[PDB]
């Protein structure tokens, strides 16, 4: 029901999961703190230095429209109607920074094509959407699993492992990662015993048979996953409650996220795991832990997430006592891709201003209003600028290529049980046109 | 800009067929499509005008259209019905008959879903559309591939074919049906020697790629096959240039159509092939080849029809001298469930008017505007009535599952060559709710 409004001369429409999927009865669930909240705030800073930024739209404020997918695309789109109500007769959208689900980019970008609506997503790693026949308006600043699976099969050649099976999740993104995974796997001499699908649905018997499934060859210990969270999550659970032990390799959904291992530590020990190569944003950690229920009004979903992440209400006035600061801050993975998906829309819309407005610095009547298939092809698709809060270290661009994707860029990881009884993630290496690993880090190795 | 065809009247309803082909890879629409558009588009015109005389059946409120020409593709699908929903927010559309292939109908039903208009398709028949959390509005007068998915693996256990391949289109029809396939063919002891998948745009070398993936099993001579039409004419042309022999098992995308076996008959010989089991339409025969240049001014794309029928052109007085009488006639396979769904929205709009609208037999105040979540969820889904046209014998009915599916009742068909030298489809079989097959019937047996 809520929406995200901001003012400035040319409006981008946003898109985030701040709910997790409802109940069979409700729309929406709870609040999501890494992939809603601490997401939708890198898009609010980010607009906020761009609008500071002197070089960068300097006499053009950029607004924003930010909306809530629930986690399920079916709402995603029921919400997606505000980009293009105005069209089928918000005032104007210039473009739409979103989509986290695959699917919700999918089902979003069937709609934005049929109004000339240039969608740019920060997380959506589907192959289908490098198909520019069907999705002509969609661009990210992620690349395409078909990188990730020639990545994850070039991990199992390395360490000679022939013998594997596959699990998956229902949706775009991991049925079609899966399928990426054994293409390049049998280009590789390596065999599947079990390929397995699994559902959010599912219950906990569900996901032990699942287990049950992947033991009837067991030739096969290494297990191979592009599953969402929660899925990840209840396998790895279901393999400590009737000790199952398996040498996972998975996807990015996984990555190095401490709350899909949290519980099921033992079974989990020894896994490699793909988290799309990104760097942390100090600037954005900064402005994160300063936000509070009073000075961040202009967030309609901020009251709902400290009540929630701080276990208060404010009807009963227990909210005040806690703070951000005073906590330990974790940035979420894909915060840079959250970043240079706005920076890139804003480099766009710069670079379509020098080329429409020559004289003014200001607004003209050319980008009144904008032309969304100019913008995308001509301006989203070639800019090259340098990504912003970046380390000294690395030198990363933004950059589009010819399908709309990003470089496939992927970092290695392995969970181990460090000293004094504490496990963590651990990076081994990364993918960048190759693996590049070091074993010395790996402990079974 | 593109052409619709629109009739007025009371209650307006959406029409969608595949006038004309997919165009080429820089053209939106090919060459017009006879039987699977023109005849398709027809019959529904042939059902209103029926409705529109018939007393029983909404004697005084009149049933007007628009109809839509998809041009094979569900992109351009998507951009034409936005016509279907304009009025929502100017032509209010209080129902949908429409989408031949599943993609079509699957892109539209996330749209109409957003604004409650209740869809009847009359040939899509993927098994994603059975699912209400997201195609809630959406119903149809064939059956879902689950069924036919079944009738397949069925026929390979009656002969005992436990060693297969499978070939499956690129999309929602090929690879829901062909995963259908596998797990009926798991739980009857058949295994799967490799699974194929032909693309959206595959090349000569590309159909000969796939065709060598299945020679490398060659115990499996059975293909099972759930193609598109173009997609199984293309595999038996690689077929027949290689040498190579199958005994295909296909789905209705084949069927009994001579379009996909002209030219590979060698290659063909011996095939099973599935078709939905239906009856040709008495008086819609004789409507049809009654049409005429001059009288069918209400088709904007019937002149287009002639021009290429009879290769002719208006622009030098050419086509007058023709009929579509003295050519033979052959009733498209589905034109049955296209009357059928016609029918099923206005029973619907008939049992609804007796509800709501109890003194006359005007549109009431209570359906201005038709509500469609009740038209769909009371009216739509309860509807059972005497197939219209039905053969004077028979006593099939018209009526959904709770769902909005039609009931699996399908003919099995060999293709043989005939006595006479020529080669030719013949029925063998029947599969409704168990298989039926007359092994004296096909040649091999
Ligand atoms: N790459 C993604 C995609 O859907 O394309 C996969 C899913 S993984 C997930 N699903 C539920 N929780 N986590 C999501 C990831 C991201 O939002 O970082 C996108
Ligand atoms: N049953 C269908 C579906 O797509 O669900 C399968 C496709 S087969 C086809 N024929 C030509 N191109 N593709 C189409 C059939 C029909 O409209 O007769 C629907
Ligand atoms: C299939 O196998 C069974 C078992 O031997 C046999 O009785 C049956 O006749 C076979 N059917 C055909 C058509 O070969």
């Given at each position: 029901?809520?929406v995200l409004?901001?003012?400035?001369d040319?409006v981008?429409?946003?898109?985030?999961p701040?709910?997790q999927?409802?109940?069979?009865?409700?729309?929406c669930?709870?609040v999501?703190?890494?992939?809603?909240?601490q997401?939708?705030e890198?898009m609010?800073?980010?607009?906020?230095?761009?609008?500071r930024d002197?070089?960068?739209?300097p006499?053009?404020r950029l607004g924003?429209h930010?909306?809530?997918?629930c986690?399920?695309?079916?709402?995603a789109?029921?919400?997606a109607?505000?980009?293009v109500?105005?069209?089928?007769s918000?005032t104007?959208?210039?473009?739409v920074?979103?989509?986290?689900?695959?699917?919700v980019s999918?089902?979003?970008?069937?709609?934005?094509?049929?109004?000339?609506?240039?969608?740019?997503s920060?997380?959506?790693?589907?192959?289908?959407?490098?198909?520019?026949?069907?999705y002509?308006?969609?661009?990210?600043?992620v690349?395409?699993?078909f990188?990730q699976?020639?990545?994850?099969?070039?991990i199992?050649?390395?360490?000679?492992?022939?013998?594997?099976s596959t699990?998956?999740?229902?949706?775009?993104?991991?049925?079609?990662?899966?399928?990426?995974?054994?293409?390049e796997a049998?280009?590789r001499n390596?065999s599947?015993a079990?390929?397995?699908?699994?559902?959010?649905a599912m219950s906990?018997?569900?996901?032990?048979?699942?287990v049950?499934?992947?033991?009837?060859?067991?030739?096969?210990?290494?297990?191979?996953?592009f599953?969402?969270?929660?899925?990840?999550?209840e396998?790895?659970?279901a393999?400590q409650?009737?000790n199952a032990?398996?040498?996972?390799?998975?996807?990015?959904?996984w990555?190095?996220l401490?709350?899909?291992?949290?519980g099921?530590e033992?079974?989990?020990?020894?896994?490699?795991?793909?988290?799309?190569?990104?760097?942390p944003i100090?600037?954005?950690?900064?402005?994160?832990?300063?936000?509070?229920?009073?000075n961040?009004?202009?967030?309609?979903w901020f009251?709902?997430?400290?009540?929630?992440?701080?276990?208060?209400?404010?009807?009963?006035?227990?909210?005040?006592a806690?703070?951000?600061?005073?906590?330990?801050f974790?940035?979420?993975?894909?915060?840079?891709?959250?970043?240079?998906?706005?920076?890139?829309?804003?480099?766009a819309?710069?670079?379509?201003?020098?080329?429409?407005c020559?004289?003014?610095t200001?607004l003209?009547?050319?980008?009144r209003?904008?032309?969304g298939?100019?913008?995308?092809?001509?301006?989203?698709?070639?800019?090259?600028?340098?990504?912003?809060?970046?380390?000294?270290?690395?030198?990363?661009?933004?950059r589009?290529?010819?399908?709309?994707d990003?470089?496939?860029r992927?970092?290695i990881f392995?969970?181990?049980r460090?000293?004094?009884?504490?496990?963590?993630?651990q990076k081994?290496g990364?993918?960048?046109?190759?693996?590049?690993?070091?074993?010395?880090?790996?402990?079974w190795?």
């Amino acid at each position: 029901k809520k929406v995200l409004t901001l003012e400035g001369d040319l409006v981008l429409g946003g898109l985030f999961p701040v709910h997790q999927k409802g109940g069979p009865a409700e729309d929406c669930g709870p609040v999501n703190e890494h992939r809603g909240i601490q997401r939708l705030e890198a898009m609010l800073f980010a607009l906020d230095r761009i609008n500071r930024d002197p070089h960068l739209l300097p006499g053009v404020r950029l607004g924003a429209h930010i909306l809530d997918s629930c986690s399920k695309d079916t709402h995603a789109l029921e919400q997606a109607l505000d980009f293009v109500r105005a069209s089928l007769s918000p005032t104007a959208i210039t473009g739409v920074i979103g989509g986290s689900y695959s699917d919700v980019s999918i089902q979003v970008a069937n709609l934005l094509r049929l109004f000339q609506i240039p969608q740019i997503s920060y997380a959506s790693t589907s192959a289908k959407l490098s198909d520019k026949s069907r999705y002509d308006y969609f661009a990210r600043t992620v690349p395409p699993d078909f990188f990730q699976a020639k990545a994850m099969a070039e991990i199992l050649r390395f360490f000679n492992w022939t013998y594997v099976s596959t699990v998956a999740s229902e949706g775009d993104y991991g049925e079609t990662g899966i399928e990426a995974f054994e293409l390049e796997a049998r280009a590789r001499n390596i065999s599947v015993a079990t390929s397995e699908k699994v559902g959010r649905a599912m219950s906990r018997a569900a996901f032990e048979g699942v287990v049950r499934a992947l033991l009837q060859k067991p030739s096969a210990r290494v297990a191979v996953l592009f599953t969402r969270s929660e899925d990840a999550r209840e396998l790895l659970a279901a393999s400590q409650r009737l000790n199952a032990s398996f040498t996972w390799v998975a996807s990015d959904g996984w990555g190095a996220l401490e709350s899909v291992v949290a519980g099921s530590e033992g079974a989990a020990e020894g896994a490699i795991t793909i988290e799309l190569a990104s760097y942390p944003i100090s600037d954005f950690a900064s402005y994160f832990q300063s936000l509070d229920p009073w000075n961040n009004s202009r967030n309609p979903w901020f009251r709902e997430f400290w009540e929630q992440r701080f276990r208060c209400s404010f009807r009963q006035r227990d909210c005040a006592a806690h703070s951000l600061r005073a906590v330990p801050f974790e940035q979420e993975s894909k915060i840079m891709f959250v970043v240079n998906a706005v920076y890139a829309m804003a480099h766009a819309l710069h670079n379509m201003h020098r080329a429409l407005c020559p004289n003014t610095t200001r607004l003209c009547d050319a980008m009144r209003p904008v032309n969304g298939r100019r913008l995308y092809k001509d301006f989203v698709l070639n800019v090259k600028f340098d990504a912003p809060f970046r380390p000294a270290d690395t030198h990363n661009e933004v950059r589009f290529d010819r399908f709309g994707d990003g470089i496939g860029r992927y970092n290695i990881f392995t969970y181990l049980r460090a000293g004094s009884g504490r496990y963590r993630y651990q990076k081994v290496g990364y993918w960048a046109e190759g693996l590049t690993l070091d074993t010395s880090l790996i402990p079974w190795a």
